Design a binder for this molecule. Structure first.
Ligand SMILES: [Mg+2]
Ligand SMILES: [Mg+2]
Ligand SMILES: [Mg+2]
Lengths: 83, 83
C-alpha cells in the first residue's frame, strides 16, 4: 500500500463549491478501495495498491468529485481585482 | 428646531470607512449645535434652528466627516463584478 494521506473531511466540499451529504467523502474513498479512518475532523486515507496515482489530498478530491458528478458544481463568477 | 433625526452611532464610521474613537459622532454633532440623546446604538439628533439643511442621517454624516477631516479616509479599490 502507498503511504497514508491526511485530509480534512470537508476539503472536497471546498474545492467543489458543494455541500455534500455527511459521509460522502469517506464512502466514496472506501468504494475505490482505500481504508479510511476518521480522527476528529481529519481523515486518514490509505489508498489501495492498484492506485499509485493517489498520493496527495488533491488526488483524493478528484475521486470524490468525479463519482458524485461534476454536474452538481454550480457556476459562480469570481470577482477579479481591478486590472 | 427641525424635527429630530434617528441614526445609528456607527453610521458615520460605516460611510467613512474609518473607526472613529468612541463618542466622536455625539461630540461633533453637539459642536454644530444639535441636542444628542443616546439609547443603546441609536442616537436621536435634534439639529439647531440655524441648520434647516440637516434633515436625514446622511446630513449628520457630512458634519462628522468634514470636521474630522476627509484625509483620514483610506483608499480601498472596490471589486466590481465581471463586466
Ligand atoms: Mg487523479
Ligand atoms: Mg496528480
Ligand atoms: Mg450637508
Amino acid at each position: 500500500s502507498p503511504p497514508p494521506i491526511r485530509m480534512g473531511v470537508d476539503v472536497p466540499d471546498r474545492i467543489a463549491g458543494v455541500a455534500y451529504p455527511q459521509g460522502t467523502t469517506a464512502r466514496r474513498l472506501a468504494q475505490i478501495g482505500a481504508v479510511v479512518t476518521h480522527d476528529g475532523d481529519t481523515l486518514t486515507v490509505t489508498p489501495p495498491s492498484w492506485r499509485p496515482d493517489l498520493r496527495q489530498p488533491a488526488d483524493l478530491v478528484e475521486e470524490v468529485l468525479r463519482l458524485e458528478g461534476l454536474e452538481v458544481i454550480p457556476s459562480v463568477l469570481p470577482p477579479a481585482p481591478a486590472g
